[PDB]
Write a protein that binds this DNA or RNA. Structure first.
Lengths: 61, 58
DNA sequence: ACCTAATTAGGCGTAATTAG
DNA sequence: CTAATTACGCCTAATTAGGT
Protein backbone atom coordinates (compact mmCIF):
# COMPACT_ATOMS: atom_id res chain seq x y z
CA UNK A 1 0.00 0.00 0.00
CA UNK A 2 1.21 3.48 -0.90
CA UNK A 3 -1.81 5.68 -1.78
CA UNK A 4 -3.47 5.45 -5.19
CA UNK A 5 -6.09 8.12 -6.10
CA UNK A 6 -7.72 8.90 -9.46
CA UNK A 7 -5.97 11.16 -11.98
CA UNK A 8 -8.23 12.56 -14.73
CA UNK A 9 -6.56 12.59 -18.12
CA UNK A 10 -7.48 15.61 -20.28
CA UNK A 11 -8.35 15.38 -23.98
CA UNK A 12 -4.69 15.94 -24.84
CA UNK A 13 -3.05 13.08 -22.95
CA UNK A 14 -6.08 11.04 -23.99
CA UNK A 15 -5.63 11.92 -27.67
CA UNK A 16 -1.93 11.13 -27.44
CA UNK A 17 -2.67 7.75 -25.87
CA UNK A 18 -5.43 6.99 -28.39
CA UNK A 19 -3.02 7.89 -31.18
CA UNK A 20 -0.47 5.57 -29.55
CA UNK A 21 -3.20 2.94 -29.08
CA UNK A 22 -3.10 2.31 -32.82
CA UNK A 23 0.34 1.17 -34.01
CA UNK A 24 0.62 -0.96 -30.84
CA UNK A 25 -2.25 -1.64 -28.41
CA UNK A 26 0.12 -3.69 -26.25
CA UNK A 27 3.23 -1.48 -25.97
CA UNK A 28 6.32 -2.83 -24.24
CA UNK A 29 8.24 -0.89 -21.56
CA UNK A 30 10.14 1.66 -23.70
CA UNK A 31 7.02 2.79 -25.56
CA UNK A 32 5.16 3.22 -22.28
CA UNK A 33 8.19 5.08 -20.94
CA UNK A 34 8.17 7.62 -23.76
CA UNK A 35 4.38 7.85 -23.58
CA UNK A 36 4.70 8.59 -19.86
CA UNK A 37 7.36 11.10 -20.84
CA UNK A 38 5.15 12.74 -23.48
CA UNK A 39 2.15 12.84 -21.14
CA UNK A 40 3.71 13.23 -17.68
CA UNK A 41 1.58 10.40 -16.31
CA UNK A 42 2.78 7.70 -13.94
CA UNK A 43 3.73 4.45 -15.70
CA UNK A 44 1.10 2.42 -13.87
CA UNK A 45 -1.51 4.91 -15.10
CA UNK A 46 -0.41 4.49 -18.73
CA UNK A 47 -0.37 0.72 -18.29
CA UNK A 48 -3.74 0.47 -16.56
CA UNK A 49 -5.12 2.78 -19.26
CA UNK A 50 -3.89 0.54 -22.08
CA UNK A 51 -5.21 -2.54 -20.27
CA UNK A 52 -8.54 -0.78 -19.91
CA UNK A 53 -8.62 0.18 -23.60
CA UNK A 54 -7.87 -3.37 -24.74
CA UNK A 55 -10.64 -4.50 -22.42
CA UNK A 56 -12.93 -1.77 -23.80
CA UNK A 57 -12.35 -2.55 -27.48
CA UNK A 58 -12.77 -6.28 -26.86
CA UNK A 59 -15.80 -5.51 -24.69
CA UNK A 60 -17.64 -4.49 -27.87
CA UNK A 61 -18.09 -6.25 -30.17
CA UNK B 1 -21.93 23.91 12.56
CA UNK B 2 -20.86 26.62 10.03
CA UNK B 3 -21.83 28.22 7.62
CA UNK B 4 -18.04 28.64 7.41
CA UNK B 5 -18.38 32.35 6.50
CA UNK B 6 -17.21 33.94 3.25
CA UNK B 7 -15.85 37.50 3.59
CA UNK B 8 -16.11 40.01 0.75
CA UNK B 9 -12.51 39.73 -0.52
CA UNK B 10 -12.44 35.95 -0.87
CA UNK B 11 -15.80 36.07 -2.63
CA UNK B 12 -14.34 38.82 -4.84
CA UNK B 13 -11.51 36.49 -5.79
CA UNK B 14 -14.20 33.85 -6.16
CA UNK B 15 -16.54 35.43 -8.74
CA UNK B 16 -13.34 36.61 -10.39
CA UNK B 17 -12.50 32.91 -10.49
CA UNK B 18 -16.01 32.05 -11.77
CA UNK B 19 -15.06 33.60 -15.12
CA UNK B 20 -12.75 31.75 -17.54
CA UNK B 21 -13.96 28.44 -16.06
CA UNK B 22 -17.53 27.61 -15.04
CA UNK B 23 -16.50 24.37 -13.31
CA UNK B 24 -12.77 23.77 -12.83
CA UNK B 25 -10.28 20.96 -12.15
CA UNK B 26 -8.57 20.07 -8.87
CA UNK B 27 -5.49 22.17 -9.70
CA UNK B 28 -7.71 25.23 -9.91
CA UNK B 29 -9.66 24.23 -6.80
CA UNK B 30 -6.34 23.76 -5.00
CA UNK B 31 -4.55 27.01 -5.87
CA UNK B 32 -7.89 28.74 -5.40
CA UNK B 33 -8.30 27.00 -2.03
CA UNK B 34 -4.81 28.25 -1.20
CA UNK B 35 -5.48 31.87 -2.19
CA UNK B 36 -8.71 31.70 -0.19
CA UNK B 37 -7.41 29.58 2.69
CA UNK B 38 -10.46 27.35 3.07
CA UNK B 39 -10.96 23.61 2.53
CA UNK B 40 -11.83 22.16 -0.88
CA UNK B 41 -15.28 21.26 0.44
CA UNK B 42 -15.83 24.97 1.04
CA UNK B 43 -14.85 25.81 -2.54
CA UNK B 44 -16.69 22.99 -4.29
CA UNK B 45 -19.86 23.72 -2.31
CA UNK B 46 -19.97 27.40 -3.32
CA UNK B 47 -19.19 26.47 -6.93
CA UNK B 48 -22.02 23.94 -6.69
CA UNK B 49 -24.59 26.31 -5.20
CA UNK B 50 -23.60 28.76 -7.92
CA UNK B 51 -24.05 25.89 -10.38
CA UNK B 52 -27.57 25.65 -8.94
CA UNK B 53 -28.44 29.33 -9.41
CA UNK B 54 -27.11 30.74 -12.68
CA UNK B 55 -29.45 28.38 -14.54
CA UNK B 56 -32.22 28.84 -11.96
CA UNK B 57 -33.11 32.14 -13.64
CA UNK B 58 -31.52 31.60 -17.06
C1' DA C 1 -39.31 36.49 5.22
C1' DC C 2 -35.13 36.58 2.78
C1' DC C 3 -30.24 35.33 1.87
C1' DT C 4 -26.76 31.20 1.55
C1' DA C 5 -23.68 26.92 2.86
C1' DA C 6 -24.09 22.83 4.25
C1' DT C 7 -25.65 18.07 3.81
C1' DT C 8 -28.36 14.57 1.72
C1' DA C 9 -29.37 10.57 -1.29
C1' DG C 10 -28.83 9.38 -6.18
C1' DG C 11 -26.75 8.58 -10.88
C1' DC C 12 -22.82 8.63 -14.20
C1' DG C 13 -17.81 7.66 -16.07
C1' DT C 14 -14.11 5.55 -15.64
C1' DA C 15 -9.60 4.90 -13.28
C1' DA C 16 -7.97 1.42 -10.04
C1' DT C 17 -8.54 -3.07 -7.82
C1' DT C 18 -9.30 -7.80 -7.81
C1' DA C 19 -10.23 -12.54 -9.32
C1' DG C 20 -8.68 -15.91 -12.34
C1' DC D 1 -1.77 -10.78 -18.92
C1' DT D 2 -7.42 -10.96 -19.12
C1' DA D 3 -12.26 -10.33 -17.48
C1' DA D 4 -15.01 -8.84 -14.05
C1' DT D 5 -15.82 -5.88 -10.22
C1' DT D 6 -15.11 -2.15 -7.10
C1' DA D 7 -14.08 2.66 -5.63
C1' DC D 8 -13.57 7.32 -6.54
C1' DG D 9 -14.47 11.97 -8.36
C1' DC D 10 -17.71 14.80 -10.21
C1' DC D 11 -21.84 16.40 -10.97
C1' DT D 12 -26.86 17.26 -9.93
C1' DA D 13 -31.05 18.85 -7.78
C1' DA D 14 -34.15 18.93 -3.11
C1' DT D 15 -33.78 19.40 1.68
C1' DT D 16 -31.40 21.27 6.15
C1' DA D 17 -29.49 24.35 9.54
C1' DG D 18 -27.32 29.82 9.58
C1' DG D 19 -26.44 34.73 9.47
C1' DT D 20 -25.88 39.71 9.28
Amino acid sequence: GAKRPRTTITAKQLETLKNAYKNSPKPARHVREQLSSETGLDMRVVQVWFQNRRAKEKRLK
